[PDB]
Swiss-Prot record, chain B:
Signal peptide: none annotated. DNA-dependent RNA polymerase catalyzes the transcription of DNA into RNA using the four ribonucleoside triphosphates as substrates. The RNAP catalytic core consists of 2 alpha, 1 beta, 1 beta' and 1 omega subunit. When a sigma factor is associated with the core the holoenzyme is formed, which can initiate transcription. This is DNA-directed RNA polymerase subunit beta. Belongs to the RNA polymerase beta chain family.
From Swiss-Prot, chain C:
The gene is rpoZ. Belongs to the RNA polymerase subunit omega family. Its EC number is 2.7.7.6. The RNAP catalytic core consists of 2 alpha, 1 beta, 1 beta' and 1 omega subunit. When a sigma factor is associated with the core the holoenzyme is formed, which can initiate transcription. Keywords: DNA-directed RNA polymerase, Nucleotidyltransferase, Transcription, Transferase. GO terms for cellular component: DNA-directed RNA polymerase complex. This is DNA-directed RNA polymerase subunit omega. It comes from the Bacteria.
UniProtKB/Swiss-Prot annotation, chain E:
Acetylated on several lysine residues in the presence of glucose. It comes from the Bacteria. The gene is rpoC. Co-administration of salinamide and rifampicin or salinamide and myxopyronin suppresses the emergence of resistance to both antibiotics. DNA-dependent RNA polymerase (RNAP) catalyzes the transcription of DNA into RNA using the four ribonucleoside triphosphates as substrates. Resistance to the antibiotics salinamide A, salinamide B, rifampicin, streptolydigin, CBR703, myxopyronin, and lipiarmycin can result from mutations in this protein. Belongs to the RNA polymerase beta' chain family. The RNAP catalytic core consists of 2 alpha, 1 beta, 1 beta' and 1 omega subunit. When a sigma factor is associated with the core the holoenzyme is formed, which can initiate transcription. The rRNA transcription and antitermination complex (rrnTAC) consists of RNAP, NusA, NusB, NusE (rpsJ), NusG, SubB, ribosomal protein S4, DNA and precursor rRNA; S4 is more flexible than other subunits. This is DNA-directed RNA polymerase subunit beta'.
From Swiss-Prot, chain H:
Residues 1-230 are annotated as: Alpha N-terminal domain (alpha-NTD). It catalyses: RNA(n) + a ribonucleoside 5'-triphosphate = RNA(n+1) + diphosphate. The chain holds residues 6 to 235 of 329 of the full protein. One of its GO terms (molecular function) is DNA binding. Changing residue 186 to C: In rpoA101; temperature-sensitive. DNA-dependent RNA polymerase (RNAP) catalyzes the transcription of DNA into RNA using the four ribonucleoside triphosphates as substrates. This subunit plays an important role in subunit assembly since its dimerization is the first step in the sequential assembly of subunits to form the holoenzyme. Part of the processive rRNA transcription and antitermination complex (rrnTAC). The complex forms an RNA-chaperone ring around the RNA exit tunnel of RNAP. It supports rapid transcription and antitermination of rRNA operons, cotranscriptional rRNA folding, and annealing of distal rRNA regions to allow correct ribosome biogenesis. This is DNA-directed RNA polymerase subunit alpha. Keywords: Acetylation, ADP-ribosylation, DNA-directed RNA polymerase, Nucleotidyltransferase, Transcription, Transferase. Its EC number is 2.7.7.6. The N-terminal domain is essential for RNAP assembly and basal transcription, whereas the C-terminal domain is involved in interaction with transcriptional regulators (such as CRP) and with upstream promoter elements.
Length: 49, 47, 75, 100, 49, 294, 50, 230
């Protein structure tokens, strides 16, 4: 049931995703990492695209 | 011409062309012609 | 500290043991279910722990004396 | 087609073989979405034939980069053509000019 | 080095340069303003440059 | 083809003269429409009373200098422009200011009339450096709409300009600053809808929400000119009847399902040449058509 | 010759017209170069990179 | 406190698509405000009718060729997407089109119903290049606003279509280009009253006074939420 709920992309699943993403940093990296500021943590905003 | 009488591109070049642009795939077609072709004495390719 | 943690670094003194003590407090809120002393504001336990550190309610020795007094009241 | 070009576009579009050029000039008997039927002039016609050329346009064939290849006919019904003019625009050609 | 990496790049820089340039007879020069909010009101209404 | 209306979710009072309204959700590209309309109306055409002219005695013009005062007359015109009046009676009130001695003159020392009032009595006009020095000025206010500067006012004013007069700008509109910005909001799925965040900071004599309501009233008043047995009577031969059951049912003299509904189950089996296969052939199609019989 | 063709087409000779803002309705303070470039769509699509 | 109200005085209908509506009078600075607000509203959201589904017989998908015709089914679908139409009574009508012989099948040959008027009658849909050729389609005309692409329509529906129901991108908006010029109107005692002429280029399926009426109604019903609470 949870697999079908996440696979069908219900609006309650998107509400759960907006709750989960909230205050959960992601790391953003671009090769080549020539120095240490080529990995930086951001807080994600969920955008269409 | 017939496909050129329907839309003519305005040319801004001021010099004449005494030699047209050749057939752009003469290198591949001519090399495989010299390979595959039957020649008597000017020895090319399979003979 | 939903933007920057330089105030919590100014409270403790060293970012590395700041990360360790915030991790221990966040584990006590996520696993143990102990009460967040700062109001929640619908936040993740890591940001609640960093907010508690920046307010100055918990520290390393404060967390140690808290878990020690829990061990004394149980055992 | 580009409003600003070079004039090499017609040469590239014909010489690429991606269009359909007319082997023998004449008049166009029947156009379709997938066929062009050209009645040859009797001067270019040989004395042992009928004088009808058929062009079978390749429609929605896949390319190597998974793009689309189809030949759209650029002539009309009863239009006279000559030997060496474009009958079908290829994938990215427009009236015999390269149009990327 | 110790230099900052969060530096404005070319469009922020063109905009701030064009904002803090100066002319000689632009529009409404030589006025005396009560402050930055009045200067913003003047430029947005279009009574000055 | 009906639209989406916004839900006001925030009036954040920074002070008594600075709010931050927030409206969400709006249709895509409507935040800039409403925000720029209200911002242009509040900046250009919101009426209100302000100081337009001061006749200070003993001073010829703006490049002279009166003494006993630590501020120059440029600073006096600036401080007089910054005053926030509200005339309730008339469209023209000439006030007076008289004060001597050591100390700053505020707006509380202004010789008030019955109609006008000062929302900032502590607003300092000048300071005085000499005990024997005094201030003696007449201050003219008017009623008008939006900012209009003294430069074009005196370029348009070419009459006999008397001595002691001094042009000043008109801060007629009560708003000192308005600057919206348009965020992105999201009804339950889509996020092309936007959220409009007005950051209005007026002077006194008004609340921010009152000025926003009056601006929308101005715009709506400006716009209000051009503003404003269904299946039983159907035949039976298209109900997948076979070529045998067709001539079976035509022996029953039936052309509509309205001529089947009265046919009782006794009649369905006492009418001739309707066997078990034809009974199933009519029964499954009445079952798939939902109708029952009996 | 570019300016001659622009003069035939009843367009500005310097190439630049005065554009207005789409949203605020105001006007950009300088003339903006407006014309017709020939744009291509390369085969590096976010459907394949994502 | 003494504002004057604008009056829709004249509509210089230049052609079937062009128009020139002038509003008069307006105070100082209201011309640009009302012009840009009406331009944004009229360019964004005006209701009109457009083609949504076409069903041609003997054709299973858009990427296919028919015999006798000259253009592909993709070209016929883009030509039908270019078709402008006006539906008066209902909200969704379904049109048919049958034509045989040799010659360009236009939009005049579509068999009209009572409450549907085809505005541009010479609009060419396809080309027939065979004597024994015939095409018979079922054009479906909806009514909405904005731009609803067919992929997001498949996203925003529930049922399965039968094979042979070609979907078309929907462009319901009738308005193509709107500019406004603010001149000084000549009222004999006021040297400040402006007039705002809204030159507007539709595609024929809408009326200019009706469009400006709908746009002012949309703007007023959006300002209701400002004028009511705070």
């Amino acid at each position: 049931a949870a697999k079908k709920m996440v696979e069908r992309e219900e609006a309650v699943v998107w509400d759960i995703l907006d709750e989960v993403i909230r205050e959960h940093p992601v790391l953003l990296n671009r090769a080549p990492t020539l120095h240490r500021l080529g990995i930086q943590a951001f807080e994600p905003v969920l955008i269409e695209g | 011409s017939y496909t050129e009488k329907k839309r003519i591109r305005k040319d801004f070049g001021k010099r004449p062309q005494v030699l047209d642009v050749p057939y752009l795939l003469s290198i591949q077609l001519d090399s495989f012609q010299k390979f595959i072709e039957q020649d008597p004495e000017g020895q090319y390719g399979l003979e | 500290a939903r933007v920057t943690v330089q105030d919590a670094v100014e409270k403790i003194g060293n970012r590395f043991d700041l990360v360790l003590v915030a991790a221990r407090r966040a584990r006590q809120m996520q696993v143990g279910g102990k009460d967040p002393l700062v109001p929640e504001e619908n936040d993740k336990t890591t940001v609640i722990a960093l907010r508690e550190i920046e307010e100055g309610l918990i520290n390393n020795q404060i967390l140690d004396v808290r878990e020690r007094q829990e061990q004394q009241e149980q055992e | 087609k580009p409003l600003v070009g070079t004039g090499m576009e017609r040469a590239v579009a014909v010489d690429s073989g991606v269009t359909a050029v007319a082997k023998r000039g004449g008049v166009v008997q029947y156009v379709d979405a997938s066929r062009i039927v050209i009645k040859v002039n009797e001067d270019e016609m040989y004395p042992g034939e009928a004088g009808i050329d058929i062009y079978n346009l390749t429609k929605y064939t896949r390319s190597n980069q998974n793009t689309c290849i189809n030949q759209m006919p650029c002539v009309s019904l009863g239009e006279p053509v000559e030997r060496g003019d474009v009958l079908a625009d290829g994938p990215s050609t427009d009236l015999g000019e390269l149009a990327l | 080095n110790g230099e900052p990496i969060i530096v404005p790049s070319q469009d922020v820089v063109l905009g701030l340069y064009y904002m803090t340039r100066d002319c000689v007879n632009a529009k409404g020069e030589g006025m005396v303003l009560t402050g930055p909010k009045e200067a913003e009101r003047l430029y947005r209404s279009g009574l000055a440059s | 083809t009906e639209f989406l209306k916004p839900r006001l979710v925030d009036i954040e009072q920074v002070s008594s003269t600075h709010a931050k309204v927030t409206l969400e959700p709006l249709e895509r590209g409507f935040g800039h429409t409403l925000g720029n309309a209200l911002r242009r109306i509040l900046l250009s055409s919101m009426p209100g009373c302000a100081v337009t002219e001061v006749e200070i005695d003993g001073v010829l013009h703006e490049y002279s200098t009166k003494e006993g005062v630590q501020e120059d007359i440029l600073e006096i015109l600036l401080n007089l422009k910054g005053l926030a009046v509200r005339v309730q009676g008339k469209d023209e009130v000439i006030l007076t200011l008289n004060k001597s001695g050591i100390g700053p003159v505020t707006a509380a020392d202004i010789t008030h009339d019955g109609d006008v009032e000062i929302v900032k009595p502590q607003h300092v006009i000048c300071h005085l450096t000499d005990e024997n020095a005094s201030i003696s000025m007449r201050i003219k206010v008017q009623r008008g709409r939006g900012y209009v500067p003294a430069s074009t006012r005196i370029h348009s004013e070419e009459d006999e300009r008397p001595i002691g007069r001094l042009l000043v700008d008109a801060c007629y509109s009560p708003v000192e600053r308005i600057a919206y910005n348009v965020e992105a909001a999201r009804v339950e799925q889509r996020t092309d809808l936007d959220k409009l965040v007005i950051e209005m900071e007026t002077n006194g004599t008004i609340d921010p929400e009152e000025a926003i309501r009056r601006a929308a009233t101005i715009l709506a008043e400006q716009l209000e000119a051009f503003v404003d047995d269904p299946i039983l009577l159907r035949p039976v031969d298209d109900l997948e009847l076979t070529v045998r059951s067709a001539n079976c049912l035509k022996a029953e003299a039936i052309h509509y399902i309205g001529d089947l509904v009265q046919r009782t189950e006794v009649e369905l089996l006492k009418t001739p040449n309707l066997g078990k296969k034809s009974l199933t052939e009519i029964k499954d199609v009445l079952a798939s058509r939902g109708l029952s019989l009996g | 010759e570019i300016k001659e063709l622009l003069k035939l087409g009843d367009l500005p000779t310097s190439g630049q017209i005065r554009l207005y803002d789409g949203r605020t309705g105001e006007q950009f303070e300088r003339p903006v170069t407006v014309g017709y470039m020939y744009m291509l769509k390369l085969n590096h699509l976010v459907d394949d990179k994502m």
